[PDB]
Design a protein around this motif. Structure first.
Motif: not given
Ligand SMILES: *[C@@H]1O[C@H](CO)[C@@H](O[C@@H]2O[C@H](CO)[C@@H](O)[C@H](O)[C@H]2NC(C)=O)[C@H](O)[C@H]1NC(C)=O
Ligand SMILES: *[C@@H]1O[C@H](CO)[C@@H](O[C@@H]2O[C@H](CO)[C@@H](O)[C@H](O)[C@H]2NC(C)=O)[C@H](O)[C@H]1NC(C)=O
Ligand SMILES: *[C@@H]1O[C@H](CO)[C@@H](O[C@@H]2O[C@H](CO)[C@@H](O)[C@H](O)[C@H]2NC(C)=O)[C@H](O)[C@H]1NC(C)=O
Ligand SMILES: *[C@@H]1O[C@H](CO)[C@@H](O[C@@H]2O[C@H](CO)[C@@H](O)[C@H](O)[C@H]2NC(C)=O)[C@H](O)[C@H]1NC(C)=O
Ligand SMILES: *[C@@H]1O[C@H](CO)[C@@H](O)[C@H](O)[C@H]1NC(C)=O
Ligand SMILES: *[C@@H]1O[C@H](CO)[C@@H](O)[C@H](O)[C@H]1NC(C)=O
Ligand SMILES: *[C@@H]1O[C@H](CO)[C@@H](O)[C@H](O)[C@H]1NC(C)=O
Ligand SMILES: *[C@@H]1O[C@H](CO)[C@@H](O)[C@H](O)[C@H]1NC(C)=O
Ligand SMILES: *[C@@H]1O[C@H](CO)[C@@H](O)[C@H](O)[C@H]1NC(C)=O
Ligand SMILES: *[C@@H]1O[C@H](CO)[C@@H](O)[C@H](O)[C@H]1NC(C)=O
Ligand SMILES: *[C@@H]1O[C@H](CO)[C@@H](O)[C@H](O)[C@H]1NC(C)=O
Ligand SMILES: *[C@@H]1O[C@H](CO)[C@@H](O)[C@H](O)[C@H]1NC(C)=O
Ligand SMILES: *[C@@H]1O[C@H](CO)[C@@H](O)[C@H](O)[C@H]1NC(C)=O
Ligand SMILES: *[C@@H]1O[C@H](CO)[C@@H](O)[C@H](O)[C@H]1NC(C)=O
Ligand SMILES: *[C@@H]1O[C@H](CO)[C@@H](O)[C@H](O)[C@H]1NC(C)=O
Ligand SMILES: *[C@@H]1O[C@H](CO)[C@@H](O)[C@H](O)[C@H]1NC(C)=O
Ligand SMILES: *[C@@H]1O[C@H](CO)[C@@H](O)[C@H](O)[C@H]1NC(C)=O
Ligand SMILES: *[C@@H]1O[C@H](CO)[C@@H](O)[C@H](O)[C@H]1NC(C)=O
Lengths: 418, 203, 426, 149, 50
Positions: A89, A91-92, A164, A167-172, A308-309, A312-313
């Motif tokens: 799940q 990408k990097q 989280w 999962g929703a964008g670039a890791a901050l 995912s839930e 990542l959340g």
């Protein structure tokens, strides 16, 4: 006669409320199977054992050997998809920071052992507790166990350093003592309850992770769900192999006896019984593997959803990401499956209080903006509903709606004005 | 007089090697914990097949006789073990009840326990045995043993009755039962379950 | 193309065949017994037994050439039940039992498994699963009143049971006991054989029963033994047990009575050579799924071949050691060869770079068509990223993007229905 | 190749029917796979033996087809139950479940019909251009600790 | 009519078991579906086929 549980007459009454005054952070293990052992069977070498005299009879049955190879190949490719959708799940490959300044939380048992596959300490326990050639074969998975352990480490390093957000964008990047205040705020407990207890909360978490190692090291009984996937495929293959030894009405179960003792016209009649029996035995295996694959796919779709839930959340689905109010969870790899460590908040040490739905002030009804009114017996307060922290009642703790007389069970008090 | 059989009288069921494996077999076997008859000789029924055992010290027992009449009137299997060999005959002749015609076959080949098994299958006589040291006295000892085959005789003789040729010895009777056999790394039978003994053994 | 029934092939990996190491040698071994069995002392024995007290000879410790007996044209029948008589010379048996007797020729029809008739009821009974041969011929040189058979019995006799009871069988309660009378009869009577009798004429009969035990064999066909080969894939025969495999020297601790060994699957796993007490291990000759890795036929005709699980040292001799052809053995003797945990891969270049997985192979390997040729490489999980964590640094988004991502889901099959009676019976 | 899911629903059923149909041409050890050959060439007493082989093979062929379609229909039903759920949660609402209605944070989605299926166009917010900042979990003004609402 | 889901679980088990029992009456090409007929009308060598 079994007991359904201890009985409990709840101390209910129309003006009494019970509010917790302390909590336990709790880590709950949860285990899901994700893929079968990939298998493929050559129906010609299984049924006929490298006899051409047999192989010619099998052509009279038409499509069946092609149709069975197709069915098992469809299962086998799906096991790589199940193994991919759960772990892949991210990408990097996020990499863990060098210094471990996580506000007192100690992840060393769930992050990689640097001395090695690069499994964590707990992933080594999980790998240790879980445990012919008649044309049957076992294929390797596409992802190797080191690749699986890099995915769990990437998911974990993202979760630790960035919440989280990965999962929703670039890791901050975010400091961990701030991430936990967002997670506490997510369950309706005010942010200050973390910081005012941070050392206690860190100790409760570190100790709870320690108890997972003791539990997992002490007893095999937790990993039953994964060991069952191994046991069912072992019994299925052994039953499919031993059905080669049955006669099905033929003079021998060894195909070279028939071909050596008998001339063709007699031999073909005997062989056709073994073909009929072995073919029915192989359809019975493939049918159960197709049904068993759908059961593992349903579990792999559930594991992909929990990743995912919960990972990542932070899910609000009651009792989905462990019992209690959910904070976060960490994935750990296991053979043929996945293990989640669900971190949860459980309230504790309740006290009774007298309560009322509203307060009358200057002839008008006041209601709390968040949480509930309570009295200790002499004074009236408002508190957040999940952890007792009484406040003096004020016009900005509260909101107003109309005259006193409508509300069933309202009580008189002063409301303070800032 | 009597003793309990314990688990003794298991034997290799066939001329096949198997190793590090549990194998299930149906055969004539001594039921575990059966009641073996014990003796300080009298002539006894043979039933489906016999377990015979004796304790070594002074080599008093030297042979056996099997048949239905035994002492002539029909052919009888005689077995002797002396000086340098086992010796076997199937005569319809007659002899005294103690140590010193139509012999259609012939063959030649306390401190210890000697165990033997006899049954009528394919060729219709068989012998198995085991021979080991002991320190138990005046009973059949506990602990495991597995008898190896000695010989198969193609002789076709009919037997219902037998007598020992001349102390302590034991007799028991085989019955058709299912057994689970533990073959170790050296293909040696090292433990067994008698499936009919109790509900745990059946499990 | 021929596997898919298509002239075009899409980019992917396809299973197409099972590879098999073909055997190079054939081995035959038997015990070297020099004796010939005394069948003349049966078929040319002076005078045969009756059917009520038939004679059995066990026949043993020899070579036997049953084809000679089968060629004896005097035998009006030579019917066989668990064997076809031409095959007998190929076999070896743990024992043979020959049964000899005489009848009137018409009764031969009864000398078979499971039949009805007074010979089958009261004199000579084969079991319903018999394995052997029945042989019979006319014998008017025997013509004479000695040849008894049984006319009555209190019950039918068992498989290979025999009954020399010369009683006056009481059909009723009456104990006439030494003399015949009403409901009390002597059950044996004899054929009066003369040339004036054709089914009433004397016939000689022999029945051969074969024994096929797990013990070492005893009566063998004339087939001469040959020398032994190790560490190579060979066709083999020991004592008439037959197969193909890699024989080896082996260490297995057989006890002296054990003739052959079996695995956990009950498969034959080792044997003792009949002419020398060495234990030979038996291992299958190597096999494995052939799969073809291809870009689309719209893009190239280049391919690579994966021999799944097979070690690269065993493949290249597939020139004759597998189902190949001359252009196909180029994917065996030549090009690049690369060992992988999934099997030996032939016709693709190994690469030290890593990329996204284009065509999957197994055990972390993938393949693709690139700078051109097919390559094989370890798959890449994506770019590495050290997140810039510290206990007091945060990053916040200054801007956003809307996105619109398509997701597709199945909802219904085609509503097919089939009339089973019209499909089956047209 | 975007519609690979829906095109598989078509291809799997086309292969199922073509395998079921081609099996009518198989002999199963009968004299011929065309029933009118047997019924022309043979007496009833013999033809029964041939016809029972064709019945035995054709019935097993059909039982295998129906059994595979029961298993394949359950897989399609699992997708229909998931699609009905995405229409209730994503279209008729705003889901707060991570990665259920596409990657990013879910705003809304729109359904479109498709052959044998459904297509959702999930509209999602994605944050796109960060900068670094110093941060601290609380601010002390005069001795009182302050936290952001 | 509201409880149709629960009533289907009852009906499907009953219909399945009744059909499994009724299949004991079928011939499958044999001379009879009563086993003792085959055991009493034929000799072993025929009876075993049936
Ligand atoms: C984090 O926790 C681990 C255990 O969960 C700690 O590891 C132990 O460290 C002490 C020495 O400090 C050793 O005596 C133990 O044998 C270690 N246990 C294991 C399993 O290695 C570790 O010290 C903690 N680290 C931090 C930074 O808190
Ligand atoms: C209810 O809570 C209030 C506030 O905690 C308590 O009132 C205080 O009592 C102490 C002495 O015990 C005084 O020094 C404070 O000045 C009081 N505060 C106020 C606002 O008056 C009260 O004692 C509690 N009552 C009970 C029954 O627990
Ligand atoms: C809350 O306080 C008000 C006064 O501030 C109470 O109202 C009075 O109630 C008495 C009877 O208890 C009446 O005789 C008066 O006429 C009422 N005065 C007014 C201004 O209405 C009220 O009863 C109190 N509420 C409760 C629940 O006791
Ligand atoms: C936020 O991002 C958008 C792009 O996603 C920026 O919009 C572009 O702005 C440039 C001028 O700077 C235009 O040439 C482009 O055509 C704009 N794109 C679109 C889709 O309109 C926007 O400027 C960014 N805003 C900030 C404050 O960074
Ligand atoms: C809350 O519970 C912990 C143990 O879980 C205890 O050490 C602590 O003192 C408690 N705090 C209060 C205020 O009760
Ligand atoms: C509340 O008080 C009553 C007695 O007044 C007691 O029985 C009950 O157990 C208490 N409940 C809680 C939640 O402490
Ligand atoms: C609570 O309910 C009881 C009736 O069960 C009633 O007598 C009492 O007055 C109620 N109290 C309040 C505060 O409403
Ligand atoms: C052995 O048999 C005798 C009877 O002959 C009986 O009294 C005795 O209890 C039996 N012993 C055992 C251990 O069964
Ligand atoms: C064995 O012989 C005895 C008499 O010697 C007889 O009673 C018995 O029936 C015979 N058994 C068989 C199987 O012939
Ligand atoms: C065994 O005993 C017999 C007499 O019973 C004797 O003739 C023979 O020599 C003995 N055996 C040997 C091997 O000497
Ligand atoms: C052997 O037995 C037969 C009868 O079966 C008898 O005629 C013969 O005299 C016997 N011979 C000897 C030496 O016992
Ligand atoms: C097998 O036998 C040898 C002696 O022949 C012995 O050393 C070895 O320990 C045995 N193996 C086992 C598992 O007992
Ligand atoms: C077979 O022949 C060889 C060579 O003549 C010999 O060594 C071997 O001992 C013979 N086999 C037997 C069973 O003696
Ligand atoms: C029997 O004798 C005849 C000559 O009389 C001979 O041809 C035949 O081969 C002999 N058969 C056997 C089995 O010895
Ligand atoms: C082959 O397929 C590719 C897309 O994968 C396409 O770009 C190319 O034009 C095609 N070429 C031919 C000759 O079909
Ligand atoms: C391949 O076979 C050779 C035979 O010498 C062996 O040394 C090597 O380890 C094998 N490699 C694999 C990967 O099987
Ligand atoms: C690729 O790696 C192998 C060892 O793994 C090495 O022998 C070879 O020289 C390398 N080639 C390149 C271009 O890196
Ligand atoms: C944030 O600052 C650190 C300072 O070392 C830098 O390494 C990192 O690349 C910066 N990240 C962003 C998103 O600007």
């Amino acid at each position: 006669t079994m007991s359904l549980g201890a009985e409990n007459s709840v101390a209910y009454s129309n003006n009494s409320i019970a509010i917790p005054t302390n909590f336990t952070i709790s880590v709950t293990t949860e285990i899901l199977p994700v893929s079968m052992t990939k298998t493929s069977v050559d129906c010609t070498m299984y049924i006929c054992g490298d006899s051409t005299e047999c192989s010619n009879l099998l052509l009279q049955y038409g499509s069946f050997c092609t149709q069975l190879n197709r069915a098992l190949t469809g299962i086998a490719v799906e096991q790589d998809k199940n193994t991919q959708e759960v772990f892949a799940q991210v990408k990097q490959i996020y990499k863990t920071p060098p210094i471990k300044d996580f506000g007192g939380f100690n992840f060393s048992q769930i992050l990689p052992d640097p001395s090695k596959s690069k499994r964590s300490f707990i992933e080594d326990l999980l790998f240790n507790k879980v445990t012919k050639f008649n044309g049957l074969t076992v294929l390797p998975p596409l992802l190797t166990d080191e690749m699986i352990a890099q995915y769990t480490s990437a998911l974990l390093a993202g979760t630790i350093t960035s919440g989280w957000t990965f999962g929703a964008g670039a890791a901050l990047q975010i400091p961990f003592a701030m991430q936990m205040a967002y997670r506490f705020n997510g369950i309706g407990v005010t942010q200050n309850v973390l910081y005012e207890n941070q050392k206690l909360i860190a100790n409760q978490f570190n100790s709870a992770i320690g108890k997972i190692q003791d539990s997992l090291s002490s007893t095999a009984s937790a990993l039953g769900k994964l060991q069952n996937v191994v046991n069912q495929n072992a019994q299925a293959l052994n039953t499919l192999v031993k059905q080669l030894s049955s006669n099905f009405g033929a003079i021998s179960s060894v195909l070279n006896d028939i071909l050596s003792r008998l001339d063709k016209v007699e031999a073909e009649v005997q062989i056709d019984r073994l073909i009929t029996g072995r073919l029915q035995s192989l359809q019975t295996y493939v049918t159960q593997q197709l049904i068993r694959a759908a059961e593992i796919r349903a579990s792999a779709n559930l594991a992909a959803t929990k990743m995912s839930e919960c990972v990542l959340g932070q899910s609000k689905r009651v009792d989905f990401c462990g019992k209690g109010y959910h904070l976060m969870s960490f994935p750990q790899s296991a053979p043929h499956g996945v293990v989640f460590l669900h971190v949860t908040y459980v309230p504790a040490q309740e006290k009774n209080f007298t309560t009322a739905p509203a307060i009358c002030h200057d002839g008008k009804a006041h209601f709390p903006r968040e949480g509930v009114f309570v009295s200790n017996g002499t004074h009236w307060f408002v508190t957040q509903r999940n952890f007792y922290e009484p406040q003096i009642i004020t016009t900005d703790n509260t909101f107003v709606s109309g005259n006193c007389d409508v509300v069933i069970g309202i009580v008189n008090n002063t409301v303070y004005d800032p | 007089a009597y003793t309990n059989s314990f688990t003794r009288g298991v034997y290799y069921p066939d001329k096949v090697f198997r190793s590090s494996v549990l194998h299930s077999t149906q055969d004539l076997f001594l039921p575990f914990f059966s009641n073996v008859t014990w003796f300080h000789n009298p002539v006894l029924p043979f039933n489906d097949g016999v377990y015979f055992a004796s304790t070594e010290k002074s080599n008093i027992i030297r042979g056996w006789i099997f048949g239905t009449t035994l002492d002539s009137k029909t052919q009888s299997l005689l077995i002797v073990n002396n000086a340098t060999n086992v010796v076997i005959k199937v005569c319809e002749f007659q002899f005294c009840n103690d140590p010193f015609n139509n012999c259609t076959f012939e063959y030649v080949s306390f401190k210890n326990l000697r165990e033997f098994v006899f049954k009528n299958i394919d060729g219709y006589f068989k012998i198995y045995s085991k021979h080991t040291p002991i320190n138990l006295v005046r009973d059949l000892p506990q602990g495991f043993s597995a008898l190896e085959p000695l010989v198969d005789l193609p002789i076709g003789i009919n037997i219902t009755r037998f007598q020992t040729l001349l102390a302590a010895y034991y007799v028991g009777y085989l019955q058709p039962r299912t057994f689970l056999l533990k073959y170790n790394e050296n293909g040696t039978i090292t433990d067994a379950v008698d499936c009919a003994l109790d509900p745990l053994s059946e499990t | 193309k021929c596997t898919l029934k298509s002239f075009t092939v899409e980019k992917g990996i396809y299973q197409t065949s099972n590879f098999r190491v073909q055997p190079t040698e054939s081995i035959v071994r038997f015990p070297n017994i020099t004796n010939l069995c005394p069948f003349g002392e049966v078929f040319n024995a002076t005078r045969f037994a009756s059917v009520y007290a038939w004679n059995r000879k066990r026949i043993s410790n020899c070579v036997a050439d049953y084809s000679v007996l089968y060629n004896s044209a005097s035998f009006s029948t030579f019917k066989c039940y668990g064997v076809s008589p031409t095959k007998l010379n190929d076999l070896c048996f743990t024992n043979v039992y020959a049964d000899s007797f005489v009848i009137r020729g018409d009764e031969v029809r009864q000398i078979a498994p499971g039949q009805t008739g007074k010979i089958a009821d009261y004199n000579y009974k084969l079991p319903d699963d018999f394995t052997g041969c029945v042989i019979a011929w006319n014998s008017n040189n025997l013509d004479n009143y000695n040849y008894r058979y049984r006319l009555f019995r209190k019950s039918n006799l068992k498989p290979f049971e025999r009954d020399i009871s010369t009683e006056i069988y009481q059909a009723g309660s009456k104990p006439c006991n030494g003399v015949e009378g009403f409901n009390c009869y002597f059950p044996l009577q004899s054929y009066g054989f003369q040339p004036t009798n054709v089914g009433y004429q004397p016939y000689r009969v022999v029945v051969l029963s074969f024994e096929l035990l797990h013990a070492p064999a005893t009566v063998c066909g004339p087939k001469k033994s040959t020398n032994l080969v190790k560490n190579k894939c060979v066709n083999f025969n020991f004592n008439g047990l037959t197969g193909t495999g890699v024989l080896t020297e082996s260490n297995k601790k057989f006890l002296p009575f054990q003739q052959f060994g079996r695995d956990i699957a009950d498969t034959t796993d080792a044997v003792r050579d009949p002419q020398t007490l060495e234990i030979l291990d038996i291992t299958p000759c190597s096999f494995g799924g052939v799969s073809v890795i291809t870009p689309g036929t719209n893009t190239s005709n280049q391919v690579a071949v994966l021999y799944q699980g097979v070690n690269c040292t065993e493949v290249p001799v597939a020139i004759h050691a597998d189902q190949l052809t001359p252009t196909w053995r180029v994917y065996s003797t030549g090009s690049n060869v690369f060992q992988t945990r999934a099997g030996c891969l032939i016709g693709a270049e190994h690469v030290n770079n890593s990329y996204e997985c284009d065509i999957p192979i197994g055990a972390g390997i993938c393949a693709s068509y690139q700078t051109q040729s097919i390559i094989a490489y370890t798959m890449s999980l994506g770019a590495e990223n050290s997140v810039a964590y510290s206990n007091n640094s945060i990053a916040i988004p200054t801007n956003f993007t809307i996105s619109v991502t398509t997701e597709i889901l199945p909802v219904s099959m085609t509503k097919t229905s089939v009339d089973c009676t019209m499909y089956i019976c047209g």
